Amino acid sequence: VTLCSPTEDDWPGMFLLAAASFTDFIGPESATAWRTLVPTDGAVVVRDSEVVGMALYMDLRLTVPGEVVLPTAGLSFVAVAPTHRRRGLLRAMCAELHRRIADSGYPVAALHASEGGIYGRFGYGPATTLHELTVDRRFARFHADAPGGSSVRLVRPTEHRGEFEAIYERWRQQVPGGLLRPQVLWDELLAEAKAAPGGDRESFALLHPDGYALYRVDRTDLKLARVSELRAVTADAHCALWRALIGLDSMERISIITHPQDPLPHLLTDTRLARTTWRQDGLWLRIMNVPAALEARGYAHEVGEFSTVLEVSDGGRFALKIGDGRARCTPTDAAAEIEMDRDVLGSLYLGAHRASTLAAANRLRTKDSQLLRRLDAAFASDVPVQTAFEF
Amino acid sequence: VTLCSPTEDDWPGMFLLAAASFTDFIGPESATAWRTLVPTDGAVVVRDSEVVGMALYMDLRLTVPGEVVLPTAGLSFVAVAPTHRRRGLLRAMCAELHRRIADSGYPVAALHASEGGIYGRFGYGPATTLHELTVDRRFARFHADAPGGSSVRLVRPTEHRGEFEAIYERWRQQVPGGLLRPQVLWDELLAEAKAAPGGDRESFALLHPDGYALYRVDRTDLKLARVSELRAVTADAHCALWRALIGLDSMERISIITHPQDPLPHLLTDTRLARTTWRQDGLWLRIMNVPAALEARGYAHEVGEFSTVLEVSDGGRFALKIGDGRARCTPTDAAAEIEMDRDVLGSLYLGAHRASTLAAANRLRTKDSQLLRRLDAAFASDVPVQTAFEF
Amino acid sequence: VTLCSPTEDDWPGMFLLAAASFTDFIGPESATAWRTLVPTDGAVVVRDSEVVGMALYMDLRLTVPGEVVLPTAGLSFVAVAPTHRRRGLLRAMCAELHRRIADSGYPVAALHASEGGIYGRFGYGPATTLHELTVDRRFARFHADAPGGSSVRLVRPTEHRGEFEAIYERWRQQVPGGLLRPQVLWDELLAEAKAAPGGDRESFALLHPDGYALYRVDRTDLKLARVSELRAVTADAHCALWRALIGLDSMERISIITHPQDPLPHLLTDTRLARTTWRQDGLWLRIMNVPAALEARGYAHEVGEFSTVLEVSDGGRFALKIGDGRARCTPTDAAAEIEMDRDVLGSLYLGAHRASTLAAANRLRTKDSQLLRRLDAAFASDVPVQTAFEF
Amino acid sequence: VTLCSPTEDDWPGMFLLAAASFTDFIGPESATAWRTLVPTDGAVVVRDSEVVGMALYMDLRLTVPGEVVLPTAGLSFVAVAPTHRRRGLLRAMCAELHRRIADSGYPVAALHASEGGIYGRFGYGPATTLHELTVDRRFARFHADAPGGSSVRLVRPTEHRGEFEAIYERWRQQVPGGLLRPQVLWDELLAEAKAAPGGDRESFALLHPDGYALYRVDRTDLKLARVSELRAVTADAHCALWRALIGLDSMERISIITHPQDPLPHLLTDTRLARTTWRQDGLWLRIMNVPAALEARGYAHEVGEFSTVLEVSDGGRFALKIGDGRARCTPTDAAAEIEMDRDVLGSLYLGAHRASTLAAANRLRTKDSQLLRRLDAAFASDVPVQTAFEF
Ligand SMILES: O=C(CCCN1CC=C(n2c(=O)[nH]c3ccccc32)CC1)c1ccc(F)cc1
Ligand SMILES: O=C(CCCN1CC=C(n2c(=O)[nH]c3ccccc32)CC1)c1ccc(F)cc1
Ligand SMILES: O=C(CCCN1CC=C(n2c(=O)[nH]c3ccccc32)CC1)c1ccc(F)cc1
Ligand SMILES: O=C(CCCN1CC=C(n2c(=O)[nH]c3ccccc32)CC1)c1ccc(F)cc1
């Protein structure tokens, strides 16, 4: 019907659509807390009267390679009523928000995808990889070389908020994929930590000066401990926390949603005991401003200075010069040496996907295999890309 | 009791131990064919009279980064009788074969591990990663950018041996992890292709000028096609074969044991449809001669010349200079800048594991983070490491 | 229609009824081998022309407490056509065979029951207990006290028939529940040992001078080894064989159908690792001649001489005197002190069930609790009752 | 760090360790009620400041054969923080409590084991056997001989506390394994009887003058009734209650955790319908004072007077004379005829395990098989050993 910024009167209608669209809907109280991260004009609704479509973005701070922090539009709360499918409501809402996001001066937008087949056509590429490890801790023995053969304390999460906040803040600034976690999201996290009748069990924390793990026993599998979050600033902290987790003698299995480069398997005499049980796209990126994004991040120092011409499909053509870990990215009408869709650049941006891999799928086109190797090396992240928290 | 090279009289006793030790035992006829790959003095047995221990190596040819082919001792048929456990028979047999392998002039030994917790202590490190992808082909749609939007033929494997041989030979020479597949292993492969009463179903082949896929419907899950092997020399061949496999309209799912950098997910509009259902160590490497191995392989051209001192624990100390994609590796008593166990070098050698990841687990020790980045970049493989065939 | 001893012409019709009645039917060749154990007049058929009912008994030798061996009628191959149910054919056939068995001079009849609710009314009581133990052998560690901390050999069963025969013969004579295993059943056992296409895997043997285990990997669960049979004459042999079985390092689990008093759990540091996964009635006994049966077996020496009057319902009344491990059992019309149905006496006879337990269910009636304790102690078996082989 | 009796200030720290260690943790309110059973100096904590280890014992009254009631130290609430494993904290805490328990004058200590591989080395032997029976009540028909072919009432548990208390008190005094159930544990039991939102369903009671059953429908399997507790003083009460339970016509299955000698199967025309679905060690015993324990219990009258010399490993050597159902147990330096570890004596003490079975595992050593038979008969319990309630 019409596409508008919602009034205060629209939010009950938005909560109804949310409840009907999201099985994990956090409820009106929690949703109202997350609103404090939505700027003025950060939300659109379609009315037919009742809300049949909604989408918004939150003001986020995303760490990219080089420990550079970018202002980031975090898309969220995106729903079309089941009564109004195949009516181009998602396309209309995504076009309006992208317009507002671009005009506001955000260099990147980000989201978590409900399905993998939807956001590629709006220029979002999967930029981090979720990697679930399940450890059969009954067989787990630490390698002779593993650090810390206690510095770790078993604590109530709500009693050590200050220490978790300070450790997380250090973590998010040093890791590509890191997000600033504002105070309202700490309020929400520590509320979810407590037990619920017929719901999740009590959360516990393992606290080190340079890391923490939040974990809870699974609702139904009482021999599975699920680590909701492990933030370690040092290798010593990461090993110490895993020694403590393998010490949960009443559990058969410890599971964590981590990143592909988690060193956990190498801490054990049997690397195979850390089984990959699940893999999925994590954070998705849409590069809003190609030159601003490419100039902002740091590049591998190991690759020698090189120049090329990059065309993003309907996204501009640029003279790209990378040397001394920095990029210069300027307008040109010179012949393109590399072509890709905007989504592909998003997938390269945090170093989670190799240019060579995307080239092999013809998502990235060049006639120079030397240029491909140089892109691969340059866009690689020294610190492996991790996922911060879902939004 | 005693450790000897087996006589012809010992092989029936070895087949009994094999049958009792290996649920996948290929049987005496097939085992006798695989013997033709075992050199004179390539086998040891422990007798108590009956065979209570055995181990052997086969003469293999392994492709490493730089399209360099190394003579490789492939350990196989390693068994201790259940009556003679915890008697140091494995250690005795592994020490004797390694002695023979080293003296024979092999720069590397390789194996497939029955368990992950066993071969690390004998200096084997996991060097390739098996990555099972399962595609729900009912939802699978190819991306607009994907090549070849037919060059592929559905054929009987036994009728196109010459073409499979020629395609495989091109594949194995261009890919790190590639093994020469001798004639006896082609005889064995095409025998396993045929249907067995109460066994596997008939194997089919999809044949392209520059690639093939061997597949069969699963024994019990009649909606699952299992790709036993897909060898593609070009991206066009890889895409064409996957278009054909997604055309198996009577199947719900196509599964393949592939490598982490398989571009398949990027060929689809929904990358998530190519689900990682399983991950395990593939080929394990023991570097027998550190300087011969390190000098033999090619290194990334992107990293500028650098020099360091590498100590392998009880494996020598070496002045290591890497530049122009080549390494020089000479004896030194100069202070070590990098320390690691022999197994760790095996894990780095084909580029499947990052020095940075192993350093984070303290399996690789240095005080210079710049040196770590340079090792990471140098040991990286341009062509992603794949697994050839199990032995 | 009519009840007759079958002619040679009837056996094809009997094999058809067998095939249709028994999913485990051994087939006409094996059935013809088992016939050699059926005496002249050991079989009845009901014809309607076609066979609609059959039953037979084999000449067996059953060991009872005191190492006494009784001639035993082993009922088997009992079937009523699905076309002729609820026509009293089973009752007619059981009455005729029991008549022949009694007149032939057998003191006891025995069977394995297809269902638990059928044979009680014909005077059969469950006399042995099948107890399946499943060991998670990955955690299994032997106790410091366990014997034999090798005497055991891994062998092909067919190559050591003489040794298995000799060990079994010693076992069956010393254990209540022991059956003589004739030559035709050894022929049949060693034929079932070999692998079958789309059937069972190859059987292996662990051979000690004073015991053997026959085992095979499960058809479908390739991490489960099933022990079909373990016959140990000494505790040393039993422990040595279990050390070897726990040495099957490619298995997660070892299962055995054993007896409730199997000492296996006490050999381990964690008794709980030997899990009871299944329990069922094994051998069923019908006491044909009460005085002959009661006088034949040995009794506990620990109980002092006592006298009572036992009435079996429609089975006679007897003055029963037990002292010095022997019983005298003579006719009397004196008042009964103990009453029970014939089936209950069968359940007491091998010591598998306590008189006190059966009394608590009112299956055994007396007004003297002292008499109950004395029966309990007297009928107890020093050597625990085991099950020999199914028939 | 240090091992102390806890102050009131320590109990919040103990509740945190409890919550993190025990998935079935009863919560601080219930735990505070169970404290009333812990004597002054009945608890130890290890502090590192925070609680990293705890253990306590409760004052219990345990019935042993001969209807003799022993003061019993019931170990419970035993936990080591996952941060402080493999630091000998359990050994230190168990040594201190055993010292206090011995000095206080308890002849026996008892516990329920979280795992089977832990308490044997501290002298605890499994002394009762939990036996789960599952009845498919749709097929269940009572035998002609079964008593009571109504005396039973369906009631709300909270309304008949006095009658349950009085029946239980009669039960616990007449059965080996019986525990006095104090008022606080009746308060706790009847609170657990009520329904919980997203928790257990409402409990019902079947009440007979001489027995009760407490049962509830399973949370998730709505065709399974679980009997939490059935206490029957007479066989008539036991049968009447089972007739009522088989009358739960909306259920497919009735399950109960009972003892191996439960007469239930013998009440049915098909004994096989009472399936053993689970078997585990119940109560564990550590004999603190060998002579006090052995002299306290009654022995079988059926065995004639005999004398032997018993050595408990690091537990004393004793002249043991058993006659007229009583034992005299005095110091001696005479040659040992029987040797066993302390844990083994615990396993024999309530008659749940036969000396012959433990001898077959070499956990009990003698050279006289006649002595073995006499021990077997003497330590046997006339009334079968049952399990009271878990602690
Ligand atoms: O509603 C959102 C975004 C929140 C997305 N959620 C995504 C992730 C979360 N969760 C988890 O990660 N595990 C959970 C289990 C139960 C419930 C929620 C879980 C929580 C948030 C919202 C609402 C109103 C706004 F203005 C702006 C935004
Ligand atoms: O026995 C071997 C090594 C073969 C290892 N196998 C390892 C891998 C194989 N397989 C598969 O990959 N899938 C299979 C399914 C059923 C049976 C075998 C399968 C086949 C070979 C041997 C025997 C005698 C020698 F002298 C030297 C060596
Ligand atoms: O047919 C019988 C009695 C045999 C009863 N069976 C009962 C037990 C056996 N089996 C097992 O124990 N496991 C088996 C697996 C597959 C097939 C058979 C199995 C084998 C025998 C027979 C036939 C003709 C006669 F004259 C007299 C008697
Ligand atoms: O915490 C204990 C011992 C209690 C052991 N539990 C063991 C057995 C029980 N349970 C069951 O049997 N089924 C249950 C289901 C849900 C919750 C508890 C269940 C309850 C008690 C304690 C606490 C403080 C003390 F001072 C002294 C002692």
Q: Where are the beta strands (DSSP E) in chain D?
A: 2-4, 43-47, 51-64, 68-80, 108-112, 125-126, 129-136, 153-155, 204-208, 211-217, 224-232, 253-258, 274-281, 283-287, 306-312, 316-323, 326-331, 338-340, 364-365
Question: Does D132 lie in the same domain as D121?
Answer: no
Closest CA to C373 of C308, C286, C319, C318: C308
Question: Does B152 lie in the same domain as B111?
Answer: no
Question: Does B350 lie in the same domain as B319?
Answer: yes
Inter-chain CB pairs, A–D, below 8 Å: 48
CA distances from C247 to A273, B52, B79 (A): 21, 12, 12
Report CB contact under 8 Å: D263, C238: no
Coil, helix or strand at residue A284: strand
- Residues in C closer than 8 angstroms to D269, CB to CB, are 117, 120
Question: Does D7 lie in the same domain as D93?
Answer: yes
Q: Which amino acid is at C14?
A: M
* Run of H or E residues at D169: helix D161-174
Q: Give the CATH number for residue C169.
A: 3.40.630.30
Tokens of D312: 């408990």
> Which of the listed residues D10, D25, D32, D34 should we mutate to test ligand 4's pocket, taking the one with most ligand atoms within 8 A of CB?
D34
Tokens of D95: 């040594």
Residues lining ligand 2, judged by CB closer than 6 Å? Answer: B 24, 26, 31, 34-35, 38, 56, 58, 76-77, 390-391
Kindly report the number of other CB atoms within 10 A of residue B183's CB atom. Answer: 11
User: What is the DSSP code string of C109-160?
Assistant: EEEE-SSTTSGGGGT-EE--EEEEEEEETTT--B-TTSS-----EEE-GGGG
Q: Nearest bound ligand to CA D28?
A: 4
Tell me how many degrees the CA angle B304-B310-B314 measures, rounded to the nearest 5.
Answer: 160
CA-based end-to-end distance of chain A:
28
Lateral strand order in the sheet of D283-287: D2-4, D43-47, D51-64, D68-80, D108-112, D283-287, D125-126
Of C198, C222, C245, the CB nearest to B197: C198
CA distances from B275 to A116, B270, D110 (A): 11, 11, 52
Closest CA to C138 of C225, C210, C69, C201: C225
Q: Which amino acid is at A119?
A: Y
Q: Which amino acid is at B97?
A: L
- Tell me whether residue C341 is in a domain: yes
- Tell me whether residue B389 is in a domain: no
- Tell me whether residue D228 is in a domain: yes
Domain count for chain D, please give it. 3
Question: Does C276 lie in the same domain as C132?
Answer: yes
- Tell me whether residue C390 is in a domain: no
Chains B and D physically touch (3 or more Cβ atom pairs below 8 Å)? no
CB B96 within 8 A of CB B327: no
- Residues in D closer than 8 angstroms to C341, CB to CB, are 145
CB C215 within 8 A of CB C238: no
Tokens of A291: 């030159």
Inter-chain CB pairs, C–D, below 8 Å: 134
Distance CA A337, CA A326 (A): 20
Q: How many CA atoms lie within 13 A of D318 on its CB side?
A: 21
CB B303 within 8 A of CB A302: yes
Distance CA B388, CA C182 (A): 54
- The reply to whether C76 sits in an annotated binding site is no
Q: How far is D345 from chain C (nearest CA, A)?
A: 13
Q: Give the CATH number for residue D369.
A: 3.30.1050.10
Distance CA A222, CA A252 (A): 9
Distance CA D53, CA A209 (A): 22
Q: How many CA atoms lie within 13 A of D148 on its CB side?
A: 17
Pairing of strands C108-112, C68-80: parallel
Distance CA C317, CA C340 (A): 11
DSSP-assigned beta bridge partners for residue D4:
D45
The reply to whether C25 belongs to the active site is no
Pairing of strands C274-281, C283-287: unpaired
Closest CA to C337 of C315, C370, C304, C361: C370
B245 phi/psi in degrees, rounded to 5: -65, -40
Question: Does D113 lie in the same domain as D3?
Answer: yes
Coil, helix or strand at residue D309: strand
Question: Does C304 lie in the same domain as C230?
Answer: no
Q: What is the signed CA dihedral for C292, C298, C303, C307, rounded to 10 degrees? A: 10
Tokens of D321: 């004379």
Q: Where are the beta strands (DSSP E) in chain C?
A: 2-4, 43-47, 51-64, 68-80, 108-112, 125-126, 129-136, 153-155, 204-208, 211-217, 224-232, 253-258, 274-281, 283-287, 306-312, 316-323, 326-331, 338-340, 364-365
Question: What letter does residue D239 receive in the DSSP assignment?
Answer: H
Residues 6+ apart with CB under 8 A from D52: D1, D17, D46, D80, D81, D83, D84, D89
CB C297 within 8 A of CB C68: yes
> Which of the listed residues B15, B59, B97, B391 should we mutate to test ligand 2's pocket, taking the one with most ligand atoms within 8 A of CB?
B391
Report CB contact under 8 Å: B279, A280: no
Q: Where are the beta strands (DSSP E) in A35-107?
A: 43-47, 51-64, 68-80
Closest CA to C182 of C194, C165, C167: C165
- Tell me whether residue D388 is in a domain: no
- Residues in C closer than 8 angstroms to D267, CB to CB, are 361
Question: Does C209 lie in the same domain as C318?
Answer: no
The domain boundary residue, chosen from A242, A257, A281: A281
Lateral strand order in the sheet of D326-331: D326-331, D316-323, D306-312, D338-340, D364-365
Q: How far is CA B7 from the centre of its chain?
A: 30
CB B342 within 8 A of CB B312: yes
Which active-site residues of B does the annotation give? 119, 391
Tell me how many degrees the CA angle B320-B326-B327 measures, rounded to the nearest 5.
Answer: 15
Distance CA A386, CA A376 (A): 19
D355, burial (CB in 10 Å: exposed 0-12, middle 13-18, buried 19+): buried
Residues 6+ apart with CB under 8 A from A155: A204, A205, A206, A207, D16, D50
Pairing of strands C125-126, C108-112: unpaired
Coil, helix or strand at residue D391: coil
Produce one character per residue of C51-69: b if its CB has 16 or more CB atoms within 10 Å, e if not. Answer: bbbbbbbbbbbbbbbbeeb
- Tell me whether residue A389 is in a domain: no
Distance CA B45, CA B56 (A): 9
Report CB contact under 8 Å: B199, C204: no
Coil, helix or strand at residue D218: coil
CB D99 within 8 A of CB D109: no
Q: Identify the closest residue of chain D to A156 by CA–CA distance.
A: D16
Q: How far is A287 from chain B (nearest CA, A)?
A: 19
State the method: X-ray
Q: Which amino acid is at A223?
A: K
B199 phi/psi in degrees, rounded to 5: -120, -150
CB B286 within 8 A of CB B346: yes
- Residues in C closer than 8 angstroms to D115, CB to CB, are 270, 272
* Run of H or E residues at A17: helix A11-21
CB A150 within 8 A of CB A244: yes
Q: Where are the beta strands (DSSP E) in chain B?
A: 2-4, 43-47, 51-64, 68-80, 108-112, 125-126, 129-136, 153-155, 204-208, 211-217, 224-232, 253-258, 274-281, 283-287, 306-312, 316-323, 326-331, 338-340, 364-365
Of A272, A354, A357, the CB nearest to B280: A272
Residues lining ligand 1, judged by CB closer than 6 Å? Answer: A 24, 26, 31, 34-35, 38, 56, 58, 76-77, 390-391
- Tell me whether residue B388 is in a domain: no
Distance CA D257, CA D321 (A): 37
- Residues in A closer than 8 angstroms to B270, CB to CB, are 115-117
Q: How many residues does chain B have?
A: 391
Question: Does C132 lie in the same domain as C270?
Answer: yes
DSSP-assigned beta bridge partners for residue D223:
none
User: What is the DSSP code string of A189-237?
Assistant: HHHHTS--TTSPPPPEEEEETTEEEEEEE-SS-TTEEEEEEEEESSHHH
Which of D238, D271, D284 best probes binding to C when mutated, by most C CB atoms within 10 angstroms?
A: D271
Chains within contact range of chain C (3+ C-beta pairs < 8 Å): B, D
C298, burial (CB in 10 Å: exposed 0-12, middle 13-18, buried 19+): middle
Distance CA A332, CA A335 (A): 9
- Tell me whether residue D146 is in a domain: yes
Distance CA A140, CA B14 (A): 33
The domain boundary residue, chosen from C281, C307, C337: C281
Question: Does C132 lie in the same domain as C115?
Answer: no
Distance CA B106, CA C167 (A): 51
Distance CA A136, CA C119 (A): 48
Tokens of B289: 């001669």
Q: What is the signed CA dihedral for A312, A313, A317, A320, rounded to 10 degrees? A: 20
Of C117, C263, C382, the CB nearest to D361: C263
* Run of H or E residues at D355: helix D355-360
Which active-site residues of A does the annotation give? 119, 391
Resolution value, angstrom units: 2.2
The domain boundary residue, chosen from D267, D286, D305: D286
Q: Which amino acid is at C67?
A: E
Question: Does C292 lie in the same domain as C345?
Answer: yes
CA distances from D109 to D6, D122, D281, D287 (A): 21, 11, 16, 7
Distance CA D276, CA C133 (A): 12
Tell me how many degrees the CA angle B358-B359-B361 measures, rounded to the nearest 5.
Answer: 65
Question: Does C118 lie in the same domain as C132?
Answer: no
Distance CA C26, CA C244 (A): 31
Report CB contact under 8 Å: A153, D83: yes
Radius of gyration of chain A (CA): 22
CB C232 within 8 A of CB C238: yes
Chains C and D physically touch (3 or more Cβ atom pairs below 8 Å)? yes
Question: What letter does residue B268 receive in the DSSP assignment?
Answer: B
Chains within contact range of chain D (3+ C-beta pairs < 8 Å): A, C
Residues 6+ apart with CB under 8 A from D277: D132, D133, D134, D255
Determine the structural domain holding residue C17 and report its residue range: 1-127+282-286
CA-based end-to-end distance of chain D:
28
Distance CA D217, CA A79 (A): 41
DSSP-assigned beta bridge partners for residue B131:
B258, B279
- What is the residue whose two structure tokens read 């097939």? B30
Distance CA B35, CA B46 (A): 18
Rounded (10°) angle between helices A183-192 and A161-174:
120
Residues 6+ apart with CB under 8 A from A122: A91, A94, A98, A286
Of A126, A146, A281, the CB nearest to B361: A146
Q: How far is D375 from chain C (nearest CA, A)?
A: 10
